[PDB]
Structure formats: structure tokens, C-alpha cells
Design a protein around this ligand. Sequence first.
Ligand SMILES: *[C@@H]1O[C@H](CO)[C@@H](O[C@@H]2O[C@H](CO)[C@@H](O)[C@H](O)[C@H]2NC(C)=O)[C@H](O)[C@H]1NC(C)=O
Ligand SMILES: *[C@@H]1O[C@H](CO[C@@H]2O[C@@H](C)[C@@H](O)[C@@H](O)[C@@H]2O)[C@@H](O)[C@H](O)[C@H]1NC(C)=O
Ligand SMILES: *[P@](C)(=O)O[C@H](C)C(C)(C)C
Ligand SMILES: *[P@](C)(=O)O[C@H](C)C(C)(C)C
Ligand SMILES: [Cl-]
Ligand SMILES: [Cl-]
Lengths: 532, 532
Amino acid sequence: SELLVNTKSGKVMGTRVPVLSSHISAFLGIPFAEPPVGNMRFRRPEPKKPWSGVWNASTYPNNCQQYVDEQFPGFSGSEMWNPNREMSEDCLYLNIWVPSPRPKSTTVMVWIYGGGFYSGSSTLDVYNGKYLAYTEEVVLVSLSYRVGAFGFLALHGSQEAPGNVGLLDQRMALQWVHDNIQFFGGDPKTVTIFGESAGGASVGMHILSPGSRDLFRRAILQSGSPNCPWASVSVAEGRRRAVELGRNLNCNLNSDEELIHCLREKKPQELIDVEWNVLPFDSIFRFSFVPVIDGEFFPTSLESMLNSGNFKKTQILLGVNKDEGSFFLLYGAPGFSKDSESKISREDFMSGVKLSVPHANDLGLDAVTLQYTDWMDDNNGIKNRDGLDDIVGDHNVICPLMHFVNKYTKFGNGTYLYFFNHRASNLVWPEWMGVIHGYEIEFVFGLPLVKELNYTAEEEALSRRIMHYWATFAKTGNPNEPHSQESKWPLFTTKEQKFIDLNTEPMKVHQRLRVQMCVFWNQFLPKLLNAT
Amino acid sequence: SELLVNTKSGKVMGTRVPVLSSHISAFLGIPFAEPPVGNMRFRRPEPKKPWSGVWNASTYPNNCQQYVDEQFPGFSGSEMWNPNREMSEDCLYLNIWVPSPRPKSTTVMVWIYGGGFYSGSSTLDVYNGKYLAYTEEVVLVSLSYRVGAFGFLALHGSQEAPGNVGLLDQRMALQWVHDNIQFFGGDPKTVTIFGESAGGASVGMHILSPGSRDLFRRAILQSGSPNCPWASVSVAEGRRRAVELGRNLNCNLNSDEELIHCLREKKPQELIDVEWNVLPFDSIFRFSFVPVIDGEFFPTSLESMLNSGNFKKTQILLGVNKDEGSFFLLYGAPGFSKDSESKISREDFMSGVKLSVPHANDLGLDAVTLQYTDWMDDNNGIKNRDGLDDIVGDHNVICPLMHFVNKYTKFGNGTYLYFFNHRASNLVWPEWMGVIHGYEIEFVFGLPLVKELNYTAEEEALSRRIMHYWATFAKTGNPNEPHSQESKWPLFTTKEQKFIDLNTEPMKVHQRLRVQMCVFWNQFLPKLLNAT
Ligand SMILES: *[C@@H]1O[C@H](CO)[C@@H](O[C@@H]2O[C@H](CO)[C@@H](O)[C@H](O)[C@H]2NC(C)=O)[C@H](O)[C@H]1NC(C)=O
Ligand SMILES: *[C@@H]1O[C@H](CO[C@@H]2O[C@@H](C)[C@@H](O)[C@@H](O)[C@@H]2O)[C@@H](O)[C@H](O)[C@H]1NC(C)=O
Ligand SMILES: *[P@](C)(=O)O[C@H](C)C(C)(C)C
Ligand SMILES: *[P@](C)(=O)O[C@H](C)C(C)(C)C
Ligand SMILES: [Cl-]
Ligand SMILES: [Cl-]
């Protein structure tokens, strides 16, 4: 039986799923760790104990416990990111889509969801692996990992809540893929990890962490990089926020043991309800429980690792969307709303700048304002709105990614950079938001191939082009088909810094992505802040 | 006799001078102060004692003792600025051009030469007042004043070398004009002071100083403003440089009395030979002996005077040239030379930035570099050369002037702003230097009306247009002829910030002159430097 697979953990039975007038096999909700429940809350994951009989892998698993977005009830633009299954702390499962007939030793791609480390689900419609697995003939895996305090509460020095456990959940799923994917017809020596936003940061973190490097071959990072300002905190800051969470829940704070015990007694929703209260600043694009620079998962600072070439040397493919900032401004900044053009007054610009760079002193804020204000036309509401989008996008996504790409490329074995700038014809969000954080994912996963979803012909073609770049890259370390006539995606090099756009128009090659602003964010501002 | 005038100081006999197929009267070398020689060196000027008989005013006076430019011997571009008469400490004289027949009560314009406070002469060919006096029917006066240490050595607290004596020379010439110009047919109630570079700064300083305000009606400032970073120093810095001059000349430094006595024994050239050695920094566009913020000539800081409206409220006309920086880069910065295109390497750019902003710390230098580097094309030699021109021009001339105009306009009675951007057809300097510091002067003084000087027809027309703006402004407080059909030079207002270009093409109105860079120079950089 094509739907029966024996693994080192036991037998699993999958399900035949229709896809684009054909079918493939899906193995959904396979456990890769023991349920991290009770006294196991906050602890490193434990390998799943093997089972007897046949694991029923016909249905999606529970999602991890998380904050749920209720800002626009019933609206598909926001609800498409929310858990679509029951939430449980029992949530460490993976999903595999397998071509039919079962392959022998094919390329494997492992998806790591984003959600700012506070949310996310492997089960979202937009992460349905069937289209990519079917079209490009890969074994497509999606893993899961604990988010929020359950994944990232960090009391450094404690073994009960050491931090980074969600990253260790991801590593354990990669370990399981390494050990077992061959039985599904996957080649464990040709595994590509790929992820978006926090999943992109996570991919970079596995590139860096000595304990993860050997578990995959190559990597794709979408709108995320390990050095993003929101993606990690120090052990002191992690400790502070954990104690502040305890304070919110009226915990005994006299020791780590007392705090952890109190926190373990709470219902999951109790933690989630006060999660946002522990942030040190009035901010946007900052999240409470995130990876911690611990000296173990990350042996030294991210900057010193990148500078010294202390990371996995392989090929990477990565890039960003045109309007990375707009999502967070909409949700978090005055003057921005879903149902208006959100033209921004000078005053709301200033408020926005302060929220966007919460760690800056007044001089730093002046620097940012000067860098992004057109002083020939400073009361232009469109320019102010677009300026803020750029500030938030450049600071949180594009410039950290550019800093990563330039550091990585000095030691790596091949870099391909993209700029995704296609606004989908059927987008439900307002026009002012442009090409939003997260909205390339639907193209990467082939949703535009589905008739009922109402994409244009050109959008289907774009999706096929992207799926083929991603999968060819996963296969070979190069997104370009050898000896094809199509226009080539050039290698990013330190010298020429080339990248391509990704849209429905003929591909163009560009150079030096947002270089002017990234010198400001990567070189000048940090120096200014360190001096003053 | 038209050439004989009786004044309160005694009788003067002038000379009939040919001008443009006609003639006018010139009274050259009239004394307005006692010779500031011997024990009077460094002291405030004394009014000239009246004389018996007839003062022979047929020939140009001596020029004040100054550093003489020998960088390009025999080259007209540089030598046109050098003294063209014998140098003497006996140099406090003025020149008057008077229409023929002698007017009754006509508009008076008083020219104050530039030269960075270290040089300058009233007698330069380029300051020949005959063309303007003849064409526009004004009484044209040019004054003189002590420059270098002779005018500006400052030992605050001493009455023997108090500082600012060159500004007091200028005021005494204005006093003489006030008291005597009526006899030459001038109206002492309608005197316009005008000057370029240090003369423009000087004009602004008379606007500010309570002791000067009553001596003139209105004012024109060309490429200079009183708040320019090179135009004044503190009393502490003036003292330091005076003592350092003494050190260079092996003076007794035990007291002001000992230092001044030593300095008074020296031949003028002895002072001049070591003048440049007292500067505190490795710099360009900085001069050794300049006006001092003394609490007397200037009652408080220039910034507090400007902020509180502590200045003469009247009409002003002022502006700048396109390439204010190039002169000083040519003379003072590596990579720049007279006979090459002076394309600038990244390395010479950095050296240039450091020389241009000598008071900045390393962070400030980084700020300037970031503000003026095109990071998409950073090795472009033309862009680097042009970037440096802008840095030097914006920092030293344009941005201080813009700061002055905006402060002044809040309290004043009418502001007219220009941007002179015509490159003269017969310019002897290289093309890379563009529209140079000082090169509007020839247009203001009507040299393009002289056939033998080889200007184009369009340049003559531009000169006539400029002379007419300047003189109509001097007459009425408005450069525009009432009820003429020509296009109007609009008033500069706080709200609309309009200015005109001045070139051979039809006049255009623009707004917000170099506003982006001037926020950097006037607001951000000073804040950065004060914090770090
Ligand atoms: C990626 O690594 C491979 C293998 O280390 C590089 O290929 C080698 O390149 C050197 C220098 O040209 C050759 O002498 C070897 O013969 C190559 N080996 C093989 C197996 O081809 C390759 O250049 C690297 N690619 C990038 C883009 O850095
Ligand atoms: C495997 O599971 C299939 C779908 O199961 C459904 O979800 C689980 C969690 C239960 O709630 C179950 O009642 C639901 O039907 C079944 O259709 C299928 O029969 C199962 N196969 C075997 C061999 O057990
Ligand atoms: P990143 C901040 O993890 O973003 C998530 C995936 C999204 C829902 C797209 C905003
Ligand atoms: P400013 C620095 O006084 O400039 C003088 C007049 C010139 C000779 C034009 C450079
Ligand atoms: Cl947009
Ligand atoms: Cl030029």
C-alpha cells in the first residue's frame, strides 16, 4: 500500500488527496516529540516514543497555543493566518506530501511557519503542500514548534525553562526528517529548509547553530533573517520579561523554581492574555517571547558568528517583498486603518517613527526622520504613509536581511537574492498596503494554480515560475535549469550585488537592494546609538 | 566746479572718468579715519582730523596689509583678487562715483569687499563703481577696512587690541557717508550697504550690531551671512589665536601689554608670514583673524540675537551662487587641481570631508559622508567631486545664509532671495569649478557692458537686469519696477519660501533653496555634535 509507510518510530497510514485533476499521498499529523505538557511545559522537547500499530495520519494535527488575531472578525485577510484547528499544548506534529507513485530518493523541502514567534500553524490553507509537491515532484514537509511563552520563555541558568525550546522543536522535527524521510521516498541528504518571516529568521538560526547545521543541505529565507531586531533578545532581557509575565499572573518571584512552578499551573490562555504586557517599550514589530542569545544554541553573538564565518557554508536563496512595513503599521500605529487610504499627518508620522524604532534615543529618532522626510513636501500624506512603510520594512526586514546576505556571501557557496513586488489581483487588503509581508507565500505554494481562487493567468504563470525556482534550487543549489533558454537569475556576489524582481512582467536584474537606506540602518544608526 | 566738493572734513577734488561713451565724477582715496599706524595698530579707528586746502582725490588709495595669493602667478583668475595698489597700514580710505551732472538727493550704495576677513581691496577692477553709478544713477561708494591681524586680532578685556576693529573701520566709513554724502548729491537716508562673502557677512553684522543699525537704510548680502561658521569666533578662541601668533613671533607672552607691544614692533609682513599657523584645525574655509562675539559690537550670541529679533528690521536682498565650494577645494583639498577635471577618489573624498567640517567628531563625519554619498555609485569621481563642492558650499555659505533668511524674515520688512547660476562665457577657471564664489560680482558691477571684456550679448543683458534689480531695490526696498511688464521677483515669505534664479534664460521662481541639506546643516548636525 502506497499510503502505508514504516518508520523508525512505527507505522503510519496516510491519505490520498486530490490535487489539480490528479492525486498524491499526504501523511498529516505525525508526532515527532513527546507532548510538551504539564511539567514538560517550557522544557526542551523529548523524542517521540515509538508506537505499536498504525498511526492514523489522515488528518491535520492540533495547532500550538497562541494569541489569536481578532482585530477584523470574519475578514479573510487576517483570519487566513489564525489557527484553523483546535489549539493544544499537544501540538508537536509534522505533515508530509508525497508524489504518487512514491519516489525513491527525491529532493525534500521542509517548511517552517512564521508568526513573529508568538503564533503560526502548519495547517493553514496557504501552507497546503500538495500543489508544490505535485507540480515539482518533491517530498514536502511542514513542521511545527511551540510559540509564545510555551516556546520561548527564557530563564537562563535554569534547565526547566532555558529558552529556545521552539527552535529545538524545529530541530527535532528536522532530526526526524533526517532519520525517516527515506521511507517516504525522500533523500535525507538533499533537504532544503524554507520559511517566511519568523520562519525565515529560524532558517538562518539553523544555519548558524552548530547543533542544527548537519541536519539539512541548503536553505531559503523569505522576508526574515536571524539578525532581525525583533528575532532575538539577550538572556538578561529574556529573564526580565519572564519575571514580568510572572508579575502579571501574581506569581511567587523569589526563585526560578517558584516562578516556573507558578507558570506551569496556569491554563495556557492565562499566559496568552498577559503576553503583550511584558514588552519593554511602546513598539510595533516587537514580540514578547523570542529566541535568546544563550551561548549554547547560539555560541556567541549573532554579529560575531556572521563576521567570523561561524555558520553552515552552503547555497542560500532569499529575499523580501516591496511593502514589508504596512501590516504592522495598520495594526499598531495611529492614522492607519483598514478602510481608508491612511494618509498620514506630520504628527502621526512622528508618532509612527517613535513606535518603529523604540530602542532609539531622541537623536536617533531625528536621524530616522531626516533620512525619510522629503523636506520639499513634508505635509504630503501619501509620502508620509509610504515613508513609514519603508521605515518599518527597512529596519525590521530588508536591511537586516541585506546585512545577512552580505556577511553570508563572503563565506558561502552561492547566494540568490529576490525582490517580490507583485500585488495580487484578488488581494482583500487595501491598496495602500501594497505588496504585503507574507503575500508571496501563496505564490510559493501554488495557490494561483487553483481555478476557484480567481487569480489571473499571468499570476498562475508567476506561481509556476516561483515554485520551479524554489524546487530547482532545492534540487541543485541553483534556481536556474541548466541549458534552458529562459532568462537567468544571476548569483548574488559581493562585487556586483545582483538580484531579480519577481512579478508578472519580464524578469529584470537589479543591483544593490536598498543600499542607501541599509547603510543608514546597518552602519550609521547603530554607531549613533552606541555613541549617544 | 563739478569735481570740487566741500565736506565736513574739508574740500576734496575728484576726477572726470570716462564710462561707456560718457563720463562721471570719481572721488578716489578720501580718508575717513586717522592712519591706524604705530601704537594705533589693533586699536579702534579714530575719526580723520579735518584738513585745510584741497584733498587730491584723483587716484586710488593704498590697500591694507594682507596675505597675497601666489598660488597661480600671472593667472588672471586669482590675481584679479590680489591688491593692485601698494600695501600700507595707512589704508583707511573710501571711493565715491557720482553721476554727472551731480545729483541732488539720490540713492546711495556702499560696497563692502570680501576676502575672508584676511584680504580684500576697494580698488579691484571688478569693484569699479563707474558702470553701476552711471547706468543706474546712484552715488556708489566703496569703503575699506583693516583685515587679518591688523583688523581682527582679539585680546578681549584689552582696550589696545579689543577685536572687531575692521568692523569698526567699516562703521566709521558708514558714519562719514552718513555725515557727508549729501554734499556729493547723495541722500543719507537712502543708503544701501552691499557686500560679498566676508563683505556679505559684514553687512549682516551691521544689521545685528545696535551701534551700526542707524547708519543705513537697507542691505544686500551676496554669498555671505553673519552666522557663517568661518565668520566669527568666541573671545576665548580669539585670545588663543592671538597668543599663538605671539608664540610664532617669539613674543613675551606674560601679559596682554607685553604681547601687544611685541606685536606692534613687528613689520606688517612678519605678522602675515605666520598668520595661517594659528588655526586650531586642519581645515579649509577657515580664517585666522575674524570678528569676535564680544558682548559689545555683538551684545549676545548671533543665534540669540536672530531668535529674539534683536536686529535692524528693514528690507534685505540676498542669495548665493551654484558652486560656492569649488574655490576652497581647489586651493585646499587633495585631488583638486586647476588644470585637470579633478575627479575625486573615495579616499580623497574622505580627506575632503574631514577638511571641510574640521570641528566635527568621527560620528559627525560619518553623518556628512552618508548625507552626500550616492551608495549606488560611490566610486564615481565626478559625483565625489561635485559632492564635495556641495558639502563645502552648503556648510559654509548656503545653509548659514538660509538660516539667516528664515530667522530674519520672521521680523523683517521684506526679503528677496536669489540663486545665481550663470557660468560666464569667458571664465578663466576650469569647467569643473562651475559658478564660482565671487563670480556674480562682475555682473553686479556691470563689467559685461564693456565691449573689450568679451562677454556675450546675453551676458550684458543679464548684467543690466541685475544692476537694475540691485539699484531699484536700493531705491525702494523692492527690486521690481512698479507697473512694468517684466516677470516679477517675488517676496520670500516664511510660508512659500520663493526665490528666483539669475541666468541668461527666462527667470524661473523656485521654492525652499537646498532645504533638505540645510535641515542637516542647521538642525541635525549641530544637535549630533552637541550630544556626542
Ligand atoms: C562552491 O563550492 C564548490 C566546491 O568547493 C566550488 O567548486 C570548486 O571551485 C574551485 C575553484 O574554481 C575548483 O578548482 C574546483 O574544481 C571546484 N569543484 C567542483 C566540484 O566543481 C564552487 O566554485 C563554489 N561555488 C561558489 C559559487 O562559491
Ligand atoms: C483514520 O481517521 C479517519 C478520519 O478521522 C477522523 O478524525 C479523528 C481524530 C476522529 O475524530 C475520527 O472519529 C474522525 O473520523 C477515519 O475516517 C478513518 O476511518 C481512520 N482509519 C482508521 C483505520 O482508523
Ligand atoms: P512574521 C513577523 O513572523 O509574519 C507572519 C508570518 C505574518 C502573519 C505573515 C504577518
Ligand atoms: P569670501 C571667503 O570673503 O571670498 C572672497 C571675496 C573671494 C576672493 C571671492 C574668494
Ligand atoms: Cl503602495
Ligand atoms: Cl559643475
